[PDB]
Design a protein around this ligand. Structure first.
Ligand SMILES: Nc1ncnc2c1ncn2[C@@H]1O[C@H](COP(=O)(O)OP(=O)(O)O)[C@@H](O)[C@H]1OP(=O)(O)O
Length: 287
């Protein structure tokens, strides 16, 4: 398993990460995490908001007790404070940053978090204030690196000016390439790592809806992998600074995802994949 530098501050992760969200039957969740590590995945992603009352963080914390903590990069997050009919409410006051961090440390049962993200931006608090408390947490050793998720270009730039941002987590896949026009270039200018979430799930849902397409399947066959591996490989190929965090609850799919790292695609291969996604009469439909 290759390792890559995520951002410029010193974080180093496995080229493929693992999203723990979906896991929240405990023994079996722990077993998936342990097998991911046995496959060389060291980067594990969660958030305070996943599971019930932080049960996903608790799960990861239990799994960690069976692993070498210092070999693993734990990413978690804070910021979503309530969810209701009216929608999601974010909070980014310094007191909340600190209390969320402490609660996550306790649920994960760790002395530090590697990568701590603002999960959702608080549009009522200047981002400098939130980042200021995150800077204090870095200086105290409570967290090592700071991430953002779903942030505007203006928020990214202003955040980074206060304390360097290590990663941006955003949706990115063959089916969702909005970040390419402005976000990707900006992250590259600032040295910020890119962490795609839903690198395969939206495509899987689509594949299922359309099933109940062939160009993608024929390209996967051509490249000796499955359609999902091709999708994940495409994301993997978008840069040395791109680390996707697909989730799964199944060991077989975990092994499939790891297998996607084997796929090698040329610039031309990549365009062909992108371009595909905007007896006498014994014939078949053309590709
Ligand atoms: N190799 C694979 N083949 C088929 N489905 C897979 C897969 N890897 C992950 N998934 C599914 O893809 C989903 C996860 O996709 P994702 O990580 O891109 O995130 P998201 O839920 O945000 O879409 C899960 O539904 C997962 O289901 P399983 O737990 O049954 O695996």
């Amino acid at each position: 398993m290759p390792r890559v530098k995520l951002g410029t501050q010193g974080l180093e992760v496995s080229k493929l990460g693992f999203g723990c969200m979906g896991l929240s039957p405990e023994e079996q969740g722990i077993a998936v995490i342990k097998e991911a590590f046995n496959c060389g995945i060291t980067f594990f992603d969660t958030s305070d908001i996943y599971g019930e009352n932080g049960s996903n963080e608790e799960l990861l914390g239990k799994a960690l007790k069976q692993l070498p903590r210092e070999k693993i990069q734990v990413g978690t997050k804070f910021g979503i404070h309530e969810i209701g009919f009216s929608g999601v409410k974010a909070k980014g006051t310094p007191d909340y940053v600190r209390s969320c961090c402490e609660a996550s440390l306790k649920r994960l049962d760790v002395d530090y978090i590697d990568l701590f993200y603002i999960h959702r931006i608080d549009t009522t608090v200047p981002i400098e204030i939130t980042m200021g408390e995150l800077k204090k947490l870095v200086e105290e050793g409570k967290i090592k690196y700071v991430g953002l998720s779903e942030a505007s270009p203006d928020t990214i730039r202003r955040a980074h000016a206060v304390h360097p941002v290590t990663a941006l987590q955003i949706e990115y896949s063959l089916w969702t390439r909005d970040i390419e026009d402005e976000i990707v270039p900006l992250c590259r200018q600032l040295g910020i790592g890119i962490v795609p979430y839903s690198p395969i799930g939206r495509g899987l849902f689509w594949g299922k809806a359309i099933k109940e397409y062939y160009r993608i399947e024929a390209l996967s066959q051509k490249h000796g992998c499955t359609p999902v591996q091709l999708a994940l490989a495409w994301v993997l190929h978008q840069g040395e600074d791109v680390v996707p965090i697909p989730g799964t609850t199944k060991i077989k799919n975990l092994h499939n995802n790891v297998g996607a790292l084997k796929v090698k695609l040329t610039k031309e291969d990549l365009k062909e994949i992108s371009d595909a996604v905007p007896w006498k009469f014994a014939n078949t439909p053309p590709l």
